[PDB]
Structure formats: structure tokens, C-alpha cells
């Protein structure tokens, strides 16, 4: 599923991501924009052989099981495929664990490089929330 900007902002708000660990909803929408272009089916292979999955490009090194990332963990206790669902519940629940891990949203390199410190409220501007 390719979400619309305001459609995804509403789905993230409904699942409790708005101001989760102090990160306003525009932060999460901005991260999803640059990670996946709002596509739940986004995948990216890393040089290390891990894979990033879904709207927030969650990695198999730590967070999900894909059966093909040697030495990895599955801290969200999900198959990585769950992160590609049209239903963002697995992505959001796992993002909550990631952003609680110590480095906040820096865990998402695209958030640090493209969202951090910018006017992230522009990502929810005009959305009925
Ligand atoms: Na894994």
C-alpha cells in the first residue's frame, strides 16, 4: 500500500505514535517519507546482508526475522514480512521499541540526515487529525 501523507499521519496517530518518546507526528511522517515514500512494500538490502522492511525501513539485523540475516535478532518478535502489510500495526509497534532503544529517532539514519532539526510540522500541515 502507498499511503497518502495525511492518510499515514492519521494511521500513525491512531496507533499512538504522535509524541511517542517526545517525537511529534511530523517527525514520524518525515521519516516514513524518506525511508519508503509511504510504501508499505518498500525493501532495501544492506551491504551487511540485512534487509530493511516497510514504511519505516526496519532492519532484520535486530528487529524482525527474515531467515537470511546470520547472527541477527528478532527483538520485535515478528516475521519481517509483517512490516510490509497494508496494516501498519506491526511497523508502529516495532518502531516504538526501536525509538525506546537509547538513540531515539537517530536509529533511522534518514531521519537524522533529512528530518532532524527541520520544520517537520509541514508534514502534517492541512491534515484533519
Ligand atoms: Na533478524
UniProtKB/Swiss-Prot annotation:
Its EC number is 3.2.1.17. Keywords: Allergen, Antimicrobial, Bacteriolytic enzyme, Disulfide bond, Glycosidase, Hydrolase, Secreted, Signal. In the egg white and polymorphonuclear leukocytes. GO terms for biological process: cell wall macromolecule catabolic process; defense response to bacterium; defense response to Gram-negative bacterium; defense response to Gram-positive bacterium; killing of cells of another organism. One of its GO terms (molecular function) is beta-N-acetylglucosaminidase activity. It comes from the Eukaryota. Lysozymes have primarily a bacteriolytic function; those in tissues and body fluids are associated with the monocyte-macrophage system and enhance the activity of immunoagents. Has bacteriolytic activity against M.luteus. Monomer. Lysozyme C is capable of both hydrolysis and transglycosylation; it also shows a slight esterase activity. It acts rapidly on both peptide-substituted and unsubstituted peptidoglycan, and slowly on chitin oligosaccharides. Belongs to the glycosyl hydrolase 22 family. This is Lysozyme C. It comes from Gallus gallus (Chicken). The lineage of its organism: Eukaryota, Metazoa, Chordata, Craniata, Vertebrata.
